[PDB]
């Protein structure tokens, strides 16, 4: 009955957050879930770009009061409903906290036959990212095997734990050149978090470095749709299996979150 909500994040730019959000959403749809994908990079939208879509309206039109969320939904590959964001619209480059809250609350109107909401967050760890991450039920950090990505992911985990008491994080290694590289990267991250924090990290697995992803970005088609048998796409199906076995939320927590009414039952 509750809707699973996954915030795809990781702090560091360019580690594959949007590629992961897009292709995980597709892989979940392919597994048989009803999936919605919110582009929460609100003023620098990329989900539509990666799928080659040209929305007539976006969240800018909702935020500015010209239409409702249901008006902007797009029926994407495998029936993933896409909520498209804006690309440089003044209105969307700084939403107030009240506008964030109103937007997150507005999703309760389109929740009807929905199993999973995937939220693609912007780069960084500012208040907007953190509001979307906190509003979700699961936090999926995308990490690459470079010191800057490990440091930024750790900084995000530290902020969410220190300032908001969050303790459970899902870690996906992306662009690994071997499965052992993904495992070794998870080991590097857990070394730092074990040393300084008390948090629970689950290793979800790895998305391999794959030229098919680069080709798909150039084609502006999801690698999962355009190269369904590439290593990256097979890896997304495996990740989707892991994600689908996550426990569903039971109770509302006390703060701003998606679909609170359904959590109250």
């Amino acid at each position: 009955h509750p809707v699973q909500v996954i915030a795809v994040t990781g702090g560091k730019g360019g580690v594959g957050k949007t590629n992961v959000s897009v292709n995980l959403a597709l892989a979940l749809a392919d597994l048989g879930r009803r999936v919605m994908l919110l582009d929460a990079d609100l003023g620098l939208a990329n989900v539509d770009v990666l799928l080659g879509l040209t929305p007539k309206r976006t969240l800018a039109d909702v935020i500015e009061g010209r239409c409702e969320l249901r008006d902007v939904l797009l029926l994407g590959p495998g029936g993933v409903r896409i909520v498209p964001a804006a690309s440089g619209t003044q209105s969307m480059v700084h939403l107030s906290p009240m506008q964030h809250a109103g937007l997150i609350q507005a999703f309760s109107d389109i929740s009807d036959n929905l199993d999973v909401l995937v939220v693609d967050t912007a780069a960084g760890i500012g208040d907007s990212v953190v509001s979307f991450v906190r509003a979700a039920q699961e936090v999926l950090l995308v990490v690459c095997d470079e010191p800057t990505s490990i440091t930024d992911a750790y900084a995000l985990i530290k902020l969410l734990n220190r300032d908001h008491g969050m303790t459970r994080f899902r870690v996906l290694a992306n662009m690994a050149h071997s499965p052992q590289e993904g495992r070794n990267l998870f080991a590097k991250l857990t070394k730092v978090t074990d040393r300084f924090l008390d948090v629970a990290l689950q290793y979800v697995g790895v998305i391999p470095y794959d030229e098919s992803v680069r080709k798909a970005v150039q084609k502006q088609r999801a690698v999962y749709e355009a190269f369904p048998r590439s290593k990256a796409s097979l890896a997304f199906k495996a990740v989707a299996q892991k994600v689908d076995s996550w426990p569903l939320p039971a109770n509302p927590r006390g703060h701003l979150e998606f679909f609170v009414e359904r959590l109250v039952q």
């Binding site: 935020i63 107030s96 009240m98 109103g102 629970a200 509302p252 006390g254 703060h255 609170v260 109250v264």
Partner: protein, 254 residues
């Protein structure tokens, strides 16, 4: 998932007696105690043991919501009402109708919201933001704080009248440092809750239980429950020995 608080300690029996004091009334409840003591378990237990058992249980954390956003969270709003009100929506009070509203960290509630909370307690009415049509609500308030409300009254940060309205038979939680003999029982309970919500499974051996009984736990219980979650992710369905604990919880020689 209603269980009487587990444990054999004196402290927890006092807490159970405080709960029995208010369990058969429909009055507002106040839960005092250090952060992480277990107040939401108490509130949901009270909810189950009341006529409102089948109604909604709605939590709000005043310390986890910005001051400027709390009014809309609590009372809801109408679509035209303010810049971010893009839809009309019921707030937490309206969602709690016929049930219980768990108002946690009320020591962080701003004074205007304390005024409106008192209005709900006394008149059983409220208005959504951007509307002044009066609405009725039949909700039981269970409030909680880890702060010294009497010092807040003296600092001017908490309203005296609200204090006298809420502070009648406060449930006073005991920190874990006063309940060491309960830790083993607590661990079983936490595992059981984890299994019940399909979140994982573990089993401790006696050496690990002993090390955890030797650990300090300033974060109280929540800290214990966090460690149980963490171990169920480190070693899913595994057996937890001292070597399976994170290094800081190992107390073989101390």
């Amino acid at each position: 998932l209603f269980r009487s608080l587990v444990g054999t300690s004196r402290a927890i029996q006092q807490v159970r007696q405080m709960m029995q004091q208010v369990a058969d009334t429909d009055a507002s409840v106040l839960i005092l105690g250090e952060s992480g003591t277990g107040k939401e378990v108490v509130a949901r237990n009270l909810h189950y043991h009341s006529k409102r058992r089948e109604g909604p249980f709605v939590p709000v954390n005043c310390g986890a919501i910005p001051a400027e956003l709390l009014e809309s969270e609590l009372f809801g709003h109408e679509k035209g009402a303010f810049t971010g009100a893009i839809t009309s929506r019921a707030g937490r009070f309206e969602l709690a109708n016929g049930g219980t509203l768990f108002l946690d960290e009320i020591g962080d509630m701003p004074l205007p919201m304390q005024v409106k909370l008192l209005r709900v307690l006394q008149e059983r009415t409220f208005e959504r933001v951007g509307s002044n049509k009066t609405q009725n609500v039949d909700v039981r308030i269970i409030a909680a704080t880890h702060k010294n409300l009497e010092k807040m009254i003296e600092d001017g940060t908490f309203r005296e009248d609200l204090y006298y309205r809420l502070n009648v038979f406060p449930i006073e939680m005991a920190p874990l440092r006063e309940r060491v003999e309960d830790i083993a029982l607590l661990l079983n309970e936490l595992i059981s809750r984890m299994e019940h919500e399909k979140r994982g499974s573990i089993r401790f051996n006696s050496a690990a239980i002993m090390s955890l009984c030797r650990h300090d736990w300033p974060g109280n219980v929540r800290e214990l429950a966090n460690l149980v979650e963490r171990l169920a992710i480190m070693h899913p369905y595994g057996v937890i020995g001292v070597g399976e604990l994170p290094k800081k919880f190992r107390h073989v020689d101390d």
